[PDB]
Write a protein that binds this ligand. Structure first.
Ligand SMILES: O=C(CCCc1ccccc1)Nc1cnccc1C(=O)O
Ligand SMILES: O=C(CCCc1ccccc1)Nc1cnccc1C(=O)O
Ligand SMILES: [Fe+2]
Ligand SMILES: [Fe+2]
Ligand SMILES: [Zn+2]
Ligand SMILES: [Zn+2]
Lengths: 330, 330
């Protein structure tokens, strides 16, 4: 068994190795990368996502989300309050303002301490889930807008043609903007490229221990748990590394910097925060190894969790028994 | 299963919890601490090993050992060259001299980098394995000179009375002084208290993965491996964290500071280095759970490894089949 401690692995593909996405994901897994639930990939020195980021101020964030916290410092829920549209130029200026800017800090460790101590007392604004891409059309390797689709993977493995098209999303962040504990829709993989700006810190639980996190979550958020058997799908629940330690939940942490890829693996619970103004791009993907996770994925049928048009087909084909109840749920 | 990632756990016993050594070791293990191979224990704020360290300059280091390296930066062997006796006062002055002092550095991470890059190009002097204790006679808790003996544990578990008496050892360190990869004699536990001075960085492999380290060691030190089936017992072999990563060996690292205890668990391979002038005290101990490790411990019978008077009895009772060949070995 490779990577039995489930450590987060960091990869440095050569230009040649960076030419076949599926092959390299399979290679990473042959080294046990998936057992951590998250891997970092540093692209070849000669590679670039696009020429410059000089002309991105005019992107619209149609619905910025103010992330409002309830609970205690290390155990809280966050709800998203919709705000008026703003351009990325306006957003960046807001992120850099005295009210929202990254505070003085010694290092990543000091900033993490400040995040968990102080996060709940501020309400940062997140420009999340914006359909689009910042990869140059001519970028041929690891272009998140040119990956093979989940629908084609499911067709290749199961011999069934289905509707749907999955495309990338942009995320414009500032200090304290947060992603709550979750696995991907249908326990898919995700790939995240940090285009520019300040770092993003990640926490992850190994897939083999995901049910331990779920059990702790039910204990820590009893109301939410009664409401929905898969409430973590709502992406509202935060639990600090201190609280995870106290409860013996195995986990790992790593900081992603601009120019680096992170891949999350099937059923790898993850959460994190942004250090300051930044922009990331992400998309879900699948491999043959995902199919069995897709079949076993928990579903929110309470109506809260956002269902994409594409997920109908995944549930319909992989989870026919669950399909009706899930459908009437939302 | 507690601590399935085999993370090094840090404990903060209260004064009340610090009153029963065996009980607290058992508690730590009930939380899965042993799976890492190493745990840190921070004593209660009210506890002290002794009043001051003002009067320790007159301790004699009868045989200081100059640690001379051969091999490459990340894979080397060290031999111990005997030097003339010196007092701890003289040793401390040598450790603080321009030739031997800790170099300027940003943090522990920068110093670790410097250690592994530069260790082989210098020959620091180690005052190791000095029989004695710096615990005050009146220190009633976690006094390493007042622990129950291995001989009494073996008697309590196996009903056999044996000769021998195990006592503590002092270690006077300076920058770059090194302990090579090893498990304890008879795969016993050890406890190490850092009395004073600069830190000690530890690396450890989880006991469940010890044979992976051994296999890599045989590959990296082929000559030594041919010479002795348990050559790591010689305590001469160093392998850097970079090399361990490259070869997929699961391991963890932690830095011990003055006033802190480290416990190594049965068959937990460990290695490390001192940051600067310091003084540690250590002793081996046993629990009921050790007996089965004692029975399976590998032995050096090539004559190189130092056998204590006490180990005869352990091998004689726990490994009667191996006893003859081991005895003629040394
Ligand atoms: O889920 C999110 C943003 C939150 C989406 C959401 C949740 C609830 C309500 C509205 C929007 N973001 C990520 C997820 N997984 C990995 C990384 C991120 C990220 O923010 O870079
Ligand atoms: O083994 C040693 C010192 C080397 C003993 C030795 C080896 C070979 C030849 C002479 C002396 N030291 C430790 C072992 N295990 C944990 C910690 C230490 C330590 O130096 O604090
Ligand atoms: Fe995600
Ligand atoms: Fe040791
Ligand atoms: Zn729900
Ligand atoms: Zn030997």
């Amino acid at each position: 068994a490779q990577n039995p401690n489930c450590n987060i692995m960091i990869f440095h593909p050569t230009k040649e190795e960076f030419n076949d996405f599926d092959k390299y994901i399979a290679y990473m897994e042959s080294q046990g990368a998936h057992r951590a639930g998250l891997a970092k990939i540093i692209p070849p020195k000669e590679w670039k996502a696009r020429e410059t980021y000089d002309n991105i101020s005019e992107i619209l964030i149609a619905t910025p989300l103010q992330q409002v916290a309830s609970g205690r410092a290390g155990v809280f829920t966050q709800y998203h309050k919709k705000k008026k549209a703003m351009t990325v130029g306006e957003y960046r200026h807001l992120a850099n303002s005295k009210k929202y800017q990254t505070p003085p800090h010694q290092n990543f460790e000091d900033l993490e301490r400040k995040y968990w101590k102080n996060r709940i007392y501020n309400s940062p604004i997140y420009g999340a889930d914006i359909s689009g891409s910042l990869f140059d059309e001519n970028t041929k390797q690891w272009n998140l807008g040119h990956l093979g689709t989940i629908q084609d993977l499911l067709e290749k493995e199961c011999g069934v043609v289905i509707e749907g098209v999955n495309t990338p999303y942009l995320y414009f962040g500032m200090w304290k903007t947060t992603f709550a504990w979750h696995t991907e829709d249908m326990d898919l993989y995700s790939i995240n490229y940090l285009h520019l700006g300040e770092p993003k810190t990640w926490y992850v639980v190994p897939p083999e221990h995901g049910q331990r996190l779920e059990r702790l979550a039910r204990e820590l958020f009893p109301g939410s748990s009664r409401g929905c058997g898969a409430f973590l799908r709502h992406k509202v629940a935060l639990i600090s590394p201190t609280v995870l330690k106290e409860n013996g939940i195995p986990f790992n942490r790593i900081t992603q910097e601009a120019g680096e890829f992170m891949v999350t693996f099937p059923y790898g619970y993850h959460a994190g925060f942004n250090h300051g103004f930044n922009c990331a791009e992400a998309i879900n993907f699948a491999t043959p190894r995902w199919i069995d996770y897709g079949k076993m994925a928990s579903q929110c049928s309470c109506g809260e969790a956002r269902v994409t048009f594409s997920m109908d087909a995944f549930v319909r084909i992989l989870q026919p028994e669950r399909y009706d109840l899930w459908k009437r749920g939302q």
